[PDB]
Design a protein around this ligand. Structure first.
Ligand SMILES: [Cl-]
Length: 481
């Protein structure tokens, strides 16, 4: 029996059928080949299992053996499970950029990630650039932005500004981005967002042996420990380069340091299913961290060169464009293109399966057709080595990195401290918004953030601090929390 599925990306919906023998990898590959995405290591398919839990599809298991919630169609979300370390250096393709951008903007707008008011407004201004192109006062008037999702509810809740006033303020900043390509606006949005404390962090409720309630943060840079009442500023950290082995047994998680002299980092999670998720995220983030410590592979450098050329091809084609296409129409056209590509894939796959069987049944002419057919079928698949390795108990040894491994956090700085223009924008915005701020509407997170700023703290400065001393010192500090 065949099963209907729907896969939702941040920019599209894909509808097609699978069979009982279809694997997670074949499902995934149908998706990424349709949308033209090759940076497959960041992404996965989420679904809801029969118990109501958010689960990620396993590639080397049949989809129909994975307990996907029974409904017609089966429902999947195509999402980034792993984040880049640094967006500007790592996101190669336009489709990969776009999808990260939309995912991260959604996290900001939904208040999944804390983002202060002044930064929320600047980000809103880049989002309007990304979505609508250059501001033009002769063309963009009352009602143009009426249906755009501009800001987190926290920000609008705590200021005494009307929608019209917000639109005007964001439009003033949008005017500053004129000439910027939509793709560059998306990249700039991500460059600003990636320095937010909560960006890219998977948070898990844990406890130490003395039973103190904590958060574990798993991200691209390492593992962080937070006090229960402060998700912005972790207290203890380990970079991925210090971890040797990770495993769990029931509720007990054990992290073995590379430092043979150091004790184990041990904690407890309230449920074994969450431990499996933690383990998968640790193993994947560690794996990608180690790729980043090594030179680009043959495949990545080629992706990068090709991306760089398609950017020029695209720009040459846009310079012949007589009329601007509005955002809604662009989105519809993109959806249509995907639908066209999915049908083409399905047709070519049927024909190639057929041509393969015509040749197999039927020699120098027949062998060539068999090869062309087989090549076409494999071109519908992604290279297995591009993907991240797949997993009561579980875990094991992590592949150690290069001998000259240098962790990047020591030399990493925020954009705001490196870029005077950004600094001065945020400063101007902070002054502007204070005129309408309602102080009785400060949230707990707002207070933590304002104190961080008052104390001169930032994301990487804090990471350097909490990673000081040898492993044993930090493991001991954890046990005493
Ligand atoms: Cl392969």
């Amino acid at each position: 029996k065949s099963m209907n599925v729907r896969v939702t990306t941040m920019d599209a919906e894909l509808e097609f059928a699978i069979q009982q023998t279809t694997t997670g990898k074949q499902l995934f590959d149908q998706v990424v080949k349709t949308i033209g995405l090759r940076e497959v290591w960041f992404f996965g398919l989420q679904y809801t299992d029969s118990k109501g839990d958010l689960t990620w599809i396993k590639l080397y298991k049949k989809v129909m053996q994975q307990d996907v919630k029974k409904e017609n169609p089966l429902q999947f979300k195509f999402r980034a499970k792993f984040y880049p370390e640094d967006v500007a250096d790592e996101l190669i393709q336009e489709i990969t950029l776009k999808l990260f951008y939309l995912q991260v903007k959604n996290a900001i707008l939904s208040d999944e990630i804390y983002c202060p008011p002044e930064t929320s407004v600047l980000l809103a201004s880049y989002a309007v650039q990304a979505r609508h192109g250059d501001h033009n006062p002769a063309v963009h008037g009352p009602g143009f932005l009426a249906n755009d999702r501009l800001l987190p509810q926290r920000v609008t809740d705590q200021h005494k500004m009307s929608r019209e006033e917000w639109e005007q303020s964001i439009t003033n900043w949008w005017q500053e981005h004129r000439g910027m390509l939509r793709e560059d606006a998306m990249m700039e949005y991500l460059k600003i967002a990636q320095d937010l404390e909560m960006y890219g962090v998977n948070y898990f409720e844990i406890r130490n042996k003395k039973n103190t309630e904590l958060w574990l943060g798993v991200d691209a840079l390492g593992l962080n420990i937070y006090e229960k009442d402060d998700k912005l500023t972790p207290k203890i950290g380990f970079p991925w380069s210090e971890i040797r082995n990770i495993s769990f047994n029931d509720r007990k998680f054990i992290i073995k340091p590379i430092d043979k002299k150091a004790p184990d980092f041990v904690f407890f999670a309230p449920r074994v299913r969450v431990n499996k998720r933690i383990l998968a995220l640790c193993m994947g983030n560690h794996e990608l961290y180690m790729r980043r410590r090594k030179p680009d592979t043959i495949d990545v450098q080629q992706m990068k060169a090709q991306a760089r050329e398609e950017k020029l091809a695209k720009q040459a084609q846009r310079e012949k464009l007589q009329l601007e296409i509005a955002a809604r129409e662009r989105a519809e056209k993109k959806q249509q293109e995907y639908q066209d590509r999915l049908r083409q894939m399905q047709e070519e796959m049927e024909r190639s399966q057929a041509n393969l069987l015509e040749a197999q049944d039927m020699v120098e002419d027949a062998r060539r057709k068999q090869d062309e057919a087989a090549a076409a079928l494999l071109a519908a698949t992604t290279p297995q080595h591009h993907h991240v390795a797949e997993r009561e108990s579980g875990g094991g040894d992590l592949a150690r990195g290069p001998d000259d491994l240098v962790d990047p956090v020591a030399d990493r700085r925020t954009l705001a401290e490196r870029n005077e223009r950004l600094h001065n924008q945020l400063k101007a915005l902070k002054q502007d918004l204070a005129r309408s701020c309602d102080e009785t509407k400060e949230t707990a997170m707002d207070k933590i953030h304002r104190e961080n700023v008052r104390q001169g703290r930032d994301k990487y400065k804090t990471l350097r601090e909490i990673r000081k001393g040898n492993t044993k010192r930090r493991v001991d500090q954890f046990e005493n929390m």
